Design a protein around this motif. Structure first.
Motif, mmCIF file in Angstrom:
data_model
loop_
_atom_site.group_PDB
_atom_site.id
_atom_site.type_symbol
_atom_site.label_atom_id
_atom_site.label_comp_id
_atom_site.label_asym_id
_atom_site.label_seq_id
_atom_site.Cartn_x
_atom_site.Cartn_y
_atom_site.Cartn_z
ATOM 1 N N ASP A 1 0.833 -1.201 0.000
ATOM 2 C CA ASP A 1 0.000 0.000 0.000
ATOM 3 C C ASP A 1 0.875 1.261 0.000
ATOM 4 O OD1 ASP A 1 -2.487 1.389 -0.013
ATOM 5 O OD2 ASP A 1 -2.624 1.398 2.177
ATOM 6 N N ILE A 2 1.882 1.277 -0.864
ATOM 7 C CA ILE A 2 2.737 2.460 -0.989
ATOM 8 C C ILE A 2 1.958 3.644 -1.615
ATOM 9 C CG2 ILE A 2 4.834 3.440 -1.981
ATOM 10 C CD1 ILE A 2 6.009 0.555 -2.023
ATOM 11 N N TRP B 1 5.076 -0.690 -9.395
ATOM 12 C CA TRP B 1 3.983 0.073 -9.970
ATOM 13 C C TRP B 1 3.566 1.239 -9.058
ATOM 14 C CZ3 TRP B 1 1.139 -0.344 -14.579
ATOM 15 C CH2 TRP B 1 -0.010 0.452 -14.634
ATOM 16 N N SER B 2 3.249 0.949 -7.802
ATOM 17 C CA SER B 2 2.760 2.000 -6.888
ATOM 18 C C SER B 2 3.799 3.106 -6.694
ATOM 19 C CB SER B 2 2.311 1.419 -5.545
ATOM 20 O OG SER B 2 3.296 0.610 -4.974
ATOM 21 N N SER C 1 6.200 3.842 6.031
ATOM 22 C CA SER C 1 5.369 3.523 7.204
ATOM 23 C C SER C 1 4.085 2.740 6.880
ATOM 24 C CB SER C 1 4.995 4.814 7.956
ATOM 25 O OG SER C 1 3.913 5.485 7.334
ATOM 26 N N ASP C 2 3.474 2.218 7.944
ATOM 27 C CA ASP C 2 2.168 1.535 7.950
ATOM 28 C C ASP C 2 2.203 0.174 7.264
ATOM 29 O OD1 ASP C 2 -0.494 0.759 8.260
ATOM 30 O OD2 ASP C 2 -1.330 2.648 7.523
ATOM 31 N N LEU D 1 -6.809 1.912 -4.780
ATOM 32 C CA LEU D 1 -7.056 1.729 -6.226
ATOM 33 C C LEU D 1 -6.241 2.603 -7.206
ATOM 34 C CD1 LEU D 1 -10.885 1.090 -6.267
ATOM 35 C CD2 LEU D 1 -9.171 -0.410 -7.322
ATOM 36 N N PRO D 2 -6.115 3.923 -6.938
ATOM 37 C CA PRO D 2 -5.285 4.743 -7.838
ATOM 38 C C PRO D 2 -3.813 4.296 -7.927
ATOM 39 C CG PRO D 2 -6.598 6.135 -6.412
ATOM 40 C CD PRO D 2 -6.742 4.739 -5.884
ATOM 41 N N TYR D 3 -3.351 3.625 -6.877
ATOM 42 C CA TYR D 3 -1.973 3.131 -6.756
ATOM 43 C C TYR D 3 -1.785 1.652 -7.096
ATOM 44 C CZ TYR D 3 -1.397 7.515 -4.411
ATOM 45 O OH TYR D 3 -1.393 8.852 -4.125
ATOM 46 N N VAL D 4 -2.863 0.857 -7.116
ATOM 47 C CA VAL D 4 -2.722 -0.596 -7.338
ATOM 48 C C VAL D 4 -2.357 -0.926 -8.779
ATOM 49 C CG1 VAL D 4 -4.224 -1.429 -5.456
ATOM 50 C CG2 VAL D 4 -5.180 -1.115 -7.774
#
Ligand SMILES: CN1CCN(c2ccc(-c3cnc4[nH]c5cnc(C#N)cc5c4c3)cc2)CC1
Length: 264
Positions: free
Chosen positions: A121-122, A183-184, A138-139, A162-165
């Motif tokens: 989840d970058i 990708w992200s 982080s996270d 979604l915009p990053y996946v």
């Protein structure tokens, strides 16, 4: 230095699904740390993974402590806040700054990948800045193991933002972990150089994504981006994850290696 662990909560640094992150100031040392205070009335795994990480571009883990239903995670504080707030809407940031941040992002990601962890989840909200503008991943609440005993495990859980996946997460049953992170990172670089995200999600039902695949770089966000970094984005934002550029090859890119920023 007696009473080295005694903190006072001063401010809501963030807010997740389970709970929140608070700034906690120390007693005798006067140290500052961030505390993830999750109300269980997932974090077990998040702690395990956190315990593995030791890198200058990863937010440091100190410890944990539960009181009934409320698990506390004590983590390095990042006084520069989120990368998200260094990106000017519709503008981005200066290209030398974006480049430095991207260099540090790659260093953090290479490290995580090297120990068989994928973040999953970058995004700029998860990329934080220390007092000297150094970038810290982080996270790890969505993070997982993709390699163990030198043996890769394919991922299948849809997660992230979604915009990053990456598109294979929306199209294939199974997929390799590392290309999804790459990708992200490309979407993050796009945001830094353009101050906007290119699509709602990378599906053929999204016209902005279709435009990109058709190579219409005369449209936004691409027209705001210089030919050099754009050429790198062309290699990262490739729909086939097996054809997508890998981090070793990103490290050899012409823009990645362009001298842009003077030292401090
Ligand atoms: C008004 N703005 C709101 C957003 N601000 C802000 C956002 C995030 C932080 C911040 C600082 N250190 C931090 N260390 C952390 C460690 N782990 C997590 C997580 N998950 C989150 C953090 C974390 C967040 C600090 C400030 C900046 C001010």
């Amino acid at each position: 230095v007696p009473f080295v662990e005694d903190w006072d909560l001063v401010q809501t640094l963030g807010e997740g699904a389970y709970g929140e992150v608070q700034l906690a100031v120390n007693r005798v040392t006067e140290e500052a740390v961030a505390v993830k205070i999750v109300d269980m009335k997932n974090i077990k795994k998040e702690i395990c993974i956190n315990k593995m990480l030791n890198h200058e571009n990863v937010v440091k883990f100190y410890g944990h402590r539960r009181e009934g239903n409320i698990q506390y995670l004590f983590l390095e504080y990042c006084s520069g806040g989120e990368l998200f707030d260094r990106i000017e809407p519709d503008i981005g940031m200066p290209e030398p700054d974006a480049q430095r941040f991207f260099h540090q992002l790659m260093a953090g990601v290479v490290y995580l990948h090297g120990i068989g962890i994928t973040h999953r989840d970058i995004k700029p909200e998860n990329l934080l800045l220390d007092e000297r503008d150094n970038l810290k991943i982080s996270d790890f609440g969505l993070a997982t193991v993709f390699r163990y005993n030198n043996r890769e495990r394919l991922l299948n859980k849809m997660c992230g933002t979604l915009p990053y996946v990456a598109p294979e997460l929306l199209k294939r049953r199974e997929f390799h972990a590392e290309p999804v992170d790459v990708w992200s990172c490309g979407i993050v670089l796009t945001a830094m150089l353009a101050g906007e995200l290119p699509w709602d999600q990378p599906s053929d039902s999204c016209q902005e994504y279709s435009d990109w695949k058709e190579k219409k770089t005369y449209l936004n966000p691409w027209k705001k981006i210089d030919s050099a970094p754009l050429a790198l984005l062309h290699k990262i934002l490739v729909e086939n994850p097996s054809a997508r550029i890998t981090i070793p090859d990103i490290k050899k890119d012409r823009w990645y290696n362009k001298p842009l920023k003077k030292g401090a």
